[PDB]
Write a protein that binds this ligand. Sequence first.
Ligand code: NA
Length: 97
Amino acid sequence: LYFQGSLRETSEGVILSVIVAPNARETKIVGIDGTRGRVKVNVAAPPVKGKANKELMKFFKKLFGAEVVIVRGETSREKDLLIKGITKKEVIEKLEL
Ligand code: NA
């Protein structure tokens, strides 16, 4: 199981496909869902008032040093994040740290 199954590079940056679980002890990557092609991300925020979406974006903006926006799944557990202006190679390097 590699992170490459959860990423693709468009003209704008990298779309990182995640599957979240809120109410977690710590925001962190906890796995890879090999069937869905998504990174399993625990989010230390409640799923109310957009707080889990905010925490998710904050985590990845800090990790990648780039603006992160939700492009699909704002009200789903399965969310696609656009990491603007970054390459897939850079995203893989940072996910593997
Ligand atoms: Na939310």
